[PDB]
Design a protein around this ligand. Structure first.
Ligand SMILES: O=C(O)C1=C[C@H](O)[C@@H](OS(=O)(=O)O)[C@H](O[C@H]2[C@H](O)[C@@H](NS(=O)(=O)O)[C@@H](O)O[C@@H]2COS(=O)(=O)O)O1
Lengths: 171, 171, 171, 171
């Protein structure tokens, strides 16, 4: 809807993503953002992190039979944003009540005992700012933790504490 | 304190920069943008690249007497943007004529025979977009090649042919 | 397992209300009840009151970009109780400290110089009785006036006057 | 041409405010100004208005039990600005989405059918020019009407109507 093409996202073709088979859309503008962690291995290079975003799309498509990597976006400790289902497609990351009404972004790693570095954190916020800018998210969007909407450890205590300090965070 | 800088810029402090001692101020919103390469080693991980930003600054300050690292902004092959002098302070990257009326961004590496990764080209443009938003660049701003305004090879034949392809490029 | 058919409430479907997008829950039995007035135009018939509810919701949803009309229930001067966020969804009518521990019912009208007609008042008391039979409210719930918890003229002076006399009212 | 240069404000002691006790801080520079009116009575003498101030504060501190008057600044029709919570302390005047990112200013009176006089209008636009000079407010800050972000008639049709003409009004 709006002119400013936004942030910096590693496109699907760049991290070598299997093609999506997903077709259902979200109604723009979206009101909620659920933050999670892959609880998998972390990476801190554009190289390892492309691999990673690939291993995760993989486990989701090849092992759980999803139409594509479950999150709308992933975040690398290389401080880069990875492209998933994107802004317009419904994701599979927070159960049936929430998947139809939110954008799910997952930090690649397990933040039970680690805080993601500032660049990781920075990517995520810009991403959200971009979402608003784009008209994808409501200007007064709300950020929820995974655990606030499903029973789980995600996004990890550390990262959990951190997103609780964010201006759009509503528990 | 509030959301970070659009463009996800690595702050002076995060790459361990020496404090700047420059005072001369630019008049945001600026009209020109000049692209150059450091002609130093390239780096491609957040680690490698912080050290390189540190390196180039140490050079400019410890050795060329400069008040701060010359450039307004530096770009790494890790695809991150490194804060240099910023939006407000006159740089030292294109001489008397151009240092006061343009913002200088520099790609870390020699790009005479290497093209830099697309993620670098991305942080660059997104860098500029976020320049109008925060309002440091004039919306209709123009891009010039370091060699388009000084007797220099920089930014290298490869980078240079690309920035030529650009939209808000010029002359 | 004792069910009363105490619900003489007009469902949203019946007043042609837009779908709510709220998901935050109230934990019953709720201890507090806050009374406000729209401060807007009042209605005296089931058909215009349905229209008025629509309006109140439109303002909160389109104008203030809220997930749904802020009150749990609305009382029309037509003597009917209009369903808002209902008994189990945290309203948005008295701030961060009261919203999550109270039911916010609001009288559709401006009561700074009118008293609501007896039937509107009967409607409200019976609504509360209802909520007690269901267990949604504590049998010993406390009623506050809007101005008692936030700076507002709400619920209007003559209405404020009346609820102060009420059995469940509390300092 | 030299530092300390803007707007006259009646300080707390001068009007006998109760010692504030609020600790939470706004982050400067602030982007939003939310305009409200007290919804009570006006005043037009340094004597009455300073009395006015106290009352308002009494309600918010005695009655609502808050840590200090809700607004950051009040305008009296006496033509003076009464120090509210200052440029640095989060106030309670517009709900939790805006309290942490706005400066809230309230005209002391009710402006539904009545408009405030040239001088209150001047004290207010002087306070803002001053907020900008101090870097308490962003240079390109935005002004909202209270009713634009909360359900309320505040700031009154006549006043609301007026601020809409304002240079920094953002619908
Ligand atoms: O712009 C707003 O005024 C506004 C934005 C949203 O619709 C909503 O939440 S948000 O910024 O998190 O998106 C918000 O509702 C608030 C409400 O303002 C608060 N009290 S109130 O002002 O009296 O209404 C409080 O209850 O928090 C609400 C959010 O609650 S939550 O979504 O259940 O977490 O209004």
């Amino acid at each position: 809807e709006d002119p400013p093409a936004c942030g910096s996202i590693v496109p699907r073709r760049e991290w070598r993503a299997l093609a999506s088979e997903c077709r259902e859309r979200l109604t723009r503008p979206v009101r909620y953002v659920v933050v999670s962690h892959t609880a998998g291995s972390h990476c801190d290079t554009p190289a390892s992190c492309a691999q990673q975003a690939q291993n995760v799309q993989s486990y989701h498509v090849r092992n759980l039979g999803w139409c594509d990597v479950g999150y709308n976006f992933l975040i690398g400790e290389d401080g880069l944003v990875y492209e998933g289902r994107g802004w317009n497609i419904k994701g599979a990351h927070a159960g049936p009540t929430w998947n139809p009404i939110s954008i799910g972004i997952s930090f690649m790693g397990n933040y039970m005992n680690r805080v993601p570095p500032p660049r990781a954190l920075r990517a995520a916020q810009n991403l959200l700012a971009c979402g608003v800018a784009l008209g994808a998210l409501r200007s007064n969007y709300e950020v929820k933790g995974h655990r606030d909407v499903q029973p789980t450890l995600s996004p990890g205590d550390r990262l959990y504490e951190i997103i609780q300090t964010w201006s759009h965070y509503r528990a």
